[PDB]
Amino acid sequence: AESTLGAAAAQSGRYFGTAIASGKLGDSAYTTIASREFNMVTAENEMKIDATEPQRGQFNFSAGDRVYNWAVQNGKQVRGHALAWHSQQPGWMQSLSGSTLRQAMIDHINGVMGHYKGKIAQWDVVSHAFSDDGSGGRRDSNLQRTGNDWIEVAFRTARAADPAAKLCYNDYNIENWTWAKTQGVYNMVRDFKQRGVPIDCVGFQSHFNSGSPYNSNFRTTLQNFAALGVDVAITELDIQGASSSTYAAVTNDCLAVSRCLGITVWGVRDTDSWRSGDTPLLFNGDGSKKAAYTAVLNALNGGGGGQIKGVGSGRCLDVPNASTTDGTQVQLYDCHSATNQQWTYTDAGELRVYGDKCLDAAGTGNGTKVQIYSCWGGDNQKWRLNSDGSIVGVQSGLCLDAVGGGTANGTLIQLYSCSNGSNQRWTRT
Amino acid sequence: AESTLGAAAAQSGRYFGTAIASGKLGDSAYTTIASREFNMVTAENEMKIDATEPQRGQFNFSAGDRVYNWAVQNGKQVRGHALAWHSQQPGWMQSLSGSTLRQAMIDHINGVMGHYKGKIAQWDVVSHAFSDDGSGGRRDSNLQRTGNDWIEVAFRTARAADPAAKLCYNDYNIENWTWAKTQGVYNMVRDFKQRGVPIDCVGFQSHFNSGSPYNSNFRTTLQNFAALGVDVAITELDIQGASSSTYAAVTNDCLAVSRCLGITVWGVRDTDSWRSGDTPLLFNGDGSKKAAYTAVLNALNGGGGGQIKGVGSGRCLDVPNASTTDGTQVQLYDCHSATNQQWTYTDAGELRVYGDKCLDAAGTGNGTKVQIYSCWGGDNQKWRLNSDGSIVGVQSGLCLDAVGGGTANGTLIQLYSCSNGSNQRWTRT
Ligand SMILES: O[C@@H]1[C@@H](O)[C@H](O[C@@H]2CO[C@@H](O[C@@H]3CO[C@@H](O[C@@H]4CO[C@@H](O[C@@H]5CO[C@@H](O)[C@H](O)[C@H]5O)[C@H](O)[C@H]4O)[C@H](O)[C@H]3O)[C@H](O)[C@H]2O)OC[C@H]1O
Ligand SMILES: O[C@@H]1[C@@H](O)[C@H](O[C@@H]2CO[C@@H](O[C@@H]3CO[C@@H](O[C@@H]4CO[C@@H](O[C@@H]5CO[C@@H](O)[C@H](O)[C@H]5O)[C@H](O)[C@H]4O)[C@H](O)[C@H]3O)[C@H](O)[C@H]2O)OC[C@H]1O
Ligand SMILES: O[C@@H]1[C@@H](O)[C@H](O[C@@H]2CO[C@@H](O[C@@H]3CO[C@@H](O[C@@H]4CO[C@@H](O)[C@H](O)[C@H]4O)[C@H](O)[C@H]3O)[C@H](O)[C@H]2O)OC[C@H]1O
Ligand SMILES: O[C@@H]1[C@@H](O)[C@H](O[C@@H]2CO[C@@H](O[C@@H]3CO[C@@H](O)[C@H](O)[C@H]3O)[C@H](O)[C@H]2O)OC[C@H]1O
Ligand SMILES: O[C@@H]1[C@@H](O)[C@H](O[C@@H]2CO[C@@H](O)[C@H](O)[C@H]2O)OC[C@H]1O
Ligand SMILES: O[C@@H]1[C@@H](O)[C@H](O[C@@H]2CO[C@@H](O)[C@H](O)[C@H]2O)OC[C@H]1O
Numbered sequence A, B: 001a002e003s004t005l006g007a008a009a010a011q012s013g014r015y016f017g018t019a020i021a022s023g024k025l026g027d028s029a030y031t032t033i034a035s036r037e038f039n040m041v042t043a044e045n046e047m048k049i050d051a052t053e054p055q056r057g058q059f060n061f062s063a064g065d066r067v068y069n070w071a072v073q074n075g076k077q078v079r080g081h082a083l084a085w086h087s088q089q090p091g092w093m094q095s096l097s098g099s100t101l102r103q104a105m106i107d108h109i110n111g112v113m114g115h116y117k118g119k120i121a122q123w124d125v126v127s128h129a130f131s132d133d134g135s136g137g138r139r140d141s142n143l144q145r146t147g148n149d150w151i152e153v154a155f156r157t158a159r160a161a162d163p164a165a166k167l168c169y170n171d172y173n174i175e176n177w178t179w180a181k182t183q184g185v186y187n188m189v190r191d192f193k194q195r196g197v198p199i200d201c202v203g204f205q206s207h208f209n210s211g212s213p214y215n216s217n218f219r220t221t222l223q224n225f226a227a228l229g230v231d232v233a234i235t236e237l238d239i240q241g242a243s244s245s246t247y248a249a250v251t252n253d254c255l256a257v258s259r260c261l262g263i264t265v266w267g268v269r270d271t272d273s274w275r276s277g278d279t280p281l282l283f284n285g286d287g288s289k290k291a292a293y294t295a296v297l298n299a300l301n302g303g304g305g306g307q308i309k310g311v312g313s314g315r316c317l318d319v320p321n322a323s324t325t326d327g328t329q330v331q332l333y334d335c336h337s338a339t340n341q342q343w344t345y346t347d348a349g350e351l352r353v354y355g356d357k358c359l360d361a362a363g364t365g366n367g368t369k370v371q372i373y374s375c376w377g378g379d380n381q382k383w384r385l386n387s388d389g390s391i392v393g394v395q396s397g398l399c400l401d402a403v404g405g406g407t408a409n410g411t412l413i414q415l416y417s418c419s420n421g422s423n424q425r426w427t428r429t
Helices: A005-010 A028-037 A062-073 A098-116 A150-161 A180-195 A218-226 A244-255 A291-301 B005-010 B028-037 B062-073 B091-095 B098-116 B150-161 B180-195 B217-227 B244-255 B291-300
Strands: A015-020 A040-043 A077-084 A122-127 A166-171 A201-204 A231-239 A260-265 A316-318 A331-333 A351-353 A357-361 A368-374 A383-385 A391-393 A399-402 A411-416 B015-020 B040-043 B077-080 B122-127 B166-171 B201-204 B231-239 B260-265 B308-310 B316-318 B331-333 B351-353 B357-361 B370-374 B383-385 B391-393 B399-402 B413-416 B426-428
Touching (some): A015 A028, A015 A077, A040 A260, A077 A098, A077 A150, A098 A150, A122 A150, A122 A201, A150 A166, A150 A180, A166 A180, A166 A231, A180 A218, A201 A218, A231 A244, A244 A260, A244 A291, A291 A383, A391 A399, B005 B015, B005 B028, B015 B077, B040 B062, B062 B077, B077 B098, B091 B098, B122 B150, B122 B201, B166 B180, B166 B231, B201 B217, B217 B231, B217 B244, B244 B260, B244 B291, B291 B383, B370 B413, B391 B399
Parallel strands (some): A015 A040, A015 A260, A040 A077, A077 A122, A122 A166, B015 B260, B040 B077, B166 B201, B201 B231
Antiparallel strands (some): A316 A331, A331 A411, A351 A357, A357 A368, A368 A411, A383 A391, B308 B316, B308 B426, B357 B370
């Protein structure tokens, strides 16, 4: 349709996936969100080395199939993660080196891909191969020590194991074009195409935080890699803070590159995140959509301080007598130029007034008063501005409502079940 | 003395306490904070009715004493809580009614106060006596039905039991002077004082949140009760969101009333709170001091938009070329009127620039670069403004530092072990 991420993404020929954790599929709230919003799936850990080959030569796909089965059963495609890398290697593989490790690497690829032959759309054949020391060179691991040619071997090996799959190179901190790591990966992919090494895509994990923040030049990076003759994909997206603007900007970068297959966010709810502390996903603990979700959905569909006029009463959201007192319920009044009517929507999804006061709801049920309270980040102060013009309380899940459909000055604002009514739509100015 | 809350408050003859949970006195991380920051203690539950008299006439002081001893052995006074109220009554008292209840109430008071006779500074003789129905009348409880004079009786009983302890009436939602409930309590205490009813104080639980927000008239309330000849005390303070200003405001209201004995916060760390979802205390779960902690400390020691100038350099905190790019490290620069030099300290402990950008630290160690990043509420975007001029990151516990003690334009800002150096002191005007 256009009401869920997967569907909106499809309007541009793209997909929108998430990372599924089999241990959570038993959680109905989890599966309800995951099944409805995404049309692409990645196993968070079930298809990795230690999970698929517990002992040398002994393969094990019970965990992986558990995820795969759920995906196909729910009309989702699957991304294979990951075939050859230094992290999460089972004990036995960690003790290997030289040609012994090299062949173990090849045997692992053959075993996993053979089992999933023709069922996986994309395979992260190699991941985390470059360093972060800022040199843009190869990562120093037991795999790289077997010879610089190990990555090329894994790809030729993967192409032979399942010709139907797209073979991707996956890595993080390669989104900023100015970072050496990014360029090092570009030169390798470039080298591969020139020599005819099988490689169909580059996956940019996209784990953004204040350590390695999103930079708008990410679009040039996608363009650049796409120009090498490969498809690009945002594979493990999550943003510390979950800024609406940052999440919206990444969505647009991909929509600007025809070779960008889609976006996968690393998880469903912040509580499921490997970095829940950074609350970097689109849904939060209770399964409610975050400000960033709306921003992402809006971007997929096409897309400072100001006033919030209610298209249906003509009056603006106003703080009674321009009070600065916490607990003051807002009202509707004749739009004019005064700070008591200037609302700023933040990347956190707050409707700030006076700079540090936040549109607040002291409850969740219908009839709950909408007031101003010191900003502290509570979901009861977070909002989602829907494209239809409604403002939904992230925590309540209710729309800002003009009491008794009133339209006269002094009409209080309240929380009520959304109705698409005129007393629930607004326009920014 | 003024490096800890207890000592700072002691400067003015007051105390700063907390609520101790017997179950955590074996948690060194917990006791390390508690024993250092407070000089007044209240058993969070150990001294309540159900806890001290599990069977009528059969008293159990095992847990109360554990807390009482820990307190005295650690230089803290003790507030008994609570002797006669409707909540948390053992199952056998709830069933009681009429004169048999009145008698039980009397005996409980004598039994418990007898045990602690002479050891308790303050006793919450009666608590939660008034309703929240707007009429300013007594809440309808099995105790109130035994006769409206139960409160007076409990107090006369208490006085006789321990003439040495200060007897307080305790309640919530009686901080706002305009509320009916507050007036009801006011009249009762005023009536008691005139008739000679032995009540020495009124405790204001002070549980503030968007539901029952703090209001500056709280001081007026305190001042009015004090005028009646009874001491006042903030007994169970906690503020939803832990706003710096609100916490400092409550502290100054008590400093403003000579009869205000002191302030008690209902818990040590947010994780210990009965309402952790509201992160209403002064210490985070990891034990680090929150922005509000310093706001209170500074206040105890006597005490929108602007420049932050370095003392040692004479230059201001500046964002290179007014960039709004996340990850941009800030520097020192000749002070001038421009938005890339106007920082706003919010109640959340943030230092905002451009309205929605936050002073950000991407790590917790020395040499961590200080930059701007979209505001989202992380502890690495919260700061404490020490009274010495230094600015300490909440999460890191590190000071803003002008690299290498540089004083020239272009000197970058980093995190570093606080040293009282002039490249770590700042004056904001
Ligand atoms: O359940 C868990 C799985 O979810 C988990 O999945 C893996 C998560 O993502 C990938 O692995 C991690 C990628 O991010 C790495 O951390 C980087 C390190 O660099 C930071 O930036 C640095 C800032 O300072 C500079 O000086 C420096 O040069 C920069 O590099 C960046 O901000 C961090 O995000 C982690 O170490 C990786 O583990 C991987 O694809 C997923 O499979 O796996 C574990 C499982 O338990
Ligand atoms: O370990 C736990 C102990 O910590 C715990 O200690 C007791 C906790 O409760 C304390 O008393 C509480 C005071 O606050 C009450 O809630 C008020 C109710 O009113 C709300 O505001 C209303 C909003 O709606 C409006 O219409 C209405 O007019 C407003 O009044 C306000 O926001 C809430 O905070 C609690 O119900 C009381 O329990 C007590 O003193 C402590 O000793 O005990 C349990 C133990 O396990
Ligand atoms: O217990 C406290 C002590 O820890 C504290 O120690 C002081 C800490 O600051 C020291 O001065 C620092 C030294 O580093 C400078 O920055 C570095 C400059 O070179 C760069 O390459 C590097 O990246 C920067 O990190 C910093 O500007 C400067 O302030 C000081 O000498 C120590 O004594 O002292 C107080 C104790 O109570
Ligand atoms: O008790 C309630 C009153 O406090 C409440 O007062 C309203 C305060 O706002 C008045 O309108 C202002 C006109 O000027 C604009 O600039 C302001 O933004 C408006 O808020 C309004 O007329 C007052 O009634 O009224 C309702 C009472 O129950
Ligand atoms: O207290 C009353 C409210 O409960 C009432 O709420 C209305 C319910 O229907 C919705 O369609 C309206 O938008 C909403 O205002 O409003 C009147 C008020 O007195
Ligand atoms: O030379 C450059 C500096 O100019 C820049 O900082 C700006 C200097 O001019 C001031 O008016 C601006 O406020 C300030 O941000 O920093 C980078 C340095 O290379």
